[PDB]
């Protein structure tokens, strides 16, 4: 799996998780350091559903070019899973490319307040923790507040792929990361809802770093709780 040192900023890599399911991986500078960042691509017949931008206008253009090169099906819809720039930065590129962009009303509001790019369409039915709605070939799930108050997770039932987004940490992380927008007290409860709702997930994809299995869920709870204790 690609690492930050192996991906120059501005390039995007794709990685088959399972049939018709890819992650996309990019790198971006934030406050003077470079970080890797993941999203998801899910085949939707002869179209593609995109989960999250590649963290910036130029990265997201590179994302679309790499999808066209490697997959060759059009991206028709995109869902952003919270309001931070690594999720919505590039939405303007997507919209101009003909992609219909979606996010919860919470994400759209927070993005606007923050001065970030704003998905066009509002995803209703996800404002209460435990809410689940169908969106093409995936289920969208609001687990409750965690990394941010608006963070969504995405399940691909055909492939048993659980995309946790930035509410889920990779196994190599032992300290909490950026908690500025987080709800540390609710984060374990939110993970518990994910665990109970998707107990058959075979692959778990964090928002940043290496994918793994279901242990990424308990691992994230461990890290968040240890931060709170300490």
Ligand X SMILES: C=CC[C@H]1c2cccc(C(=O)O)c2C(=O)N1c1cccc(OC)c1
Binding to ligand X by residue 172, rule CB under 6 A? Answer: no
Contact characters 166-185, Zn ion, x per CB under 5 A: x-------------------
Is 166 a binder of ligand X (CB under 6 A)? yes
Indicate which single residue of 13, 43, 77, 84 sits in contact with ligand X (rule: CB under 6 A). 84
Which of the residues are catalytic?
A: 82, 84, 86, 147, 178
Q: What are phi and psi of 27, to 5 degrees?
A: -135, 145
Binders of ligand X among residues 93 to 112 (CB under 6 A) are none
Which part of the chain contacts ligand X (CB under 6 A), choosing from 42-50, 65-73, 129-137, 176-184? 176-184
What's the distance, Cα to Cα, between the start and end of the chain in Å?
Answer: 32
Strands (E), 113-216: 121-122, 132-135, 138-141, 153-156, 161-165, 203-206
Which residues inside 26-65 make contact with ligand X, applying CB under 6 A? 30, 35
Please report how close the Cβ of residue 215 comes to ligand X at its closest, in angstroms: 18
| Backbone torsion region of residue 133, taken as left when φ is above 0, otherwise alpha when ψ lies between -120 and 50, otherwise beta | beta
How far apart CA 93 and CA 102 sit, in angstroms, is 14
Residue with Cβ nearer ligand X (84 or 108): 84
Our finding on whether 25 is near Zn ion (CB under 5 A) is no
182 and 148 in contact (C-beta within 8 Å)?
yes
With CB under 5 A as the contact rule, the residue among 43, 84, 108, 193 that binds Zn ion is 84
197 marked as binding residue: no
Residue 127 found at the interface with ligand X (CB under 6 A): no
Cα separation values, 214 from 21, 29, 133, Å? 17, 29, 22
Residue 86, annotated as binding a ligand: yes
């Amino acid at each position: 799996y690609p690492t930050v040192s192996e991906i120059p900023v501005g390039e995007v890599r794709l990685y088959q998780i399972a049939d018709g399911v890819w992650s996309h991986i990019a790198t971006q500078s934030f406050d003077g350091a470079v970080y890797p960042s993941n999203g998801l691509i899910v085949r939707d017949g002869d179209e593609l559903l995109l989960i999250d931008t590649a963290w910036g206008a130029k990265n997201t253009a590179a994302l679309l070019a790499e999808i066209e090169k490697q997959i060759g099906l059009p991206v028709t819809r995109a869902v952003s899973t919270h309001f931070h720039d690594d999720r919505v930065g590039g939405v303007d590129v997507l919209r101009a490319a003909g992609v219909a962009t979606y996010a919860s009303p919470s994400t759209r509001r927070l993005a606007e307040v923050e001065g970030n790019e704003i998905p066009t369409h509002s995803l209703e039915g996800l404002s209460s923790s435990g809410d689940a709605v169908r969106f093409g070939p995936v289920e969208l799930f609001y687990p409750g507040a965690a990394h941010s108050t608006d963070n969504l997770v995405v399940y691909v039932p055909s492939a048993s792929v659980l995309y946790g987004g930035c509410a889920i940490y990779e196994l190599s992380r032992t300290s909490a990361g950026n908690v500025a927008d987080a709800d540390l007290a609710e984060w374990p409860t939110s993970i518990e809802r994910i665990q109970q709702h998707y107990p058959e997930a075979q692959f778990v994809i964090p928002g940043h770093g290496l994918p793994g299995g279901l242990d990424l869920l308990k691992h994230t709870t461990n890290v968040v709780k240890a931060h709170t204790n300490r």
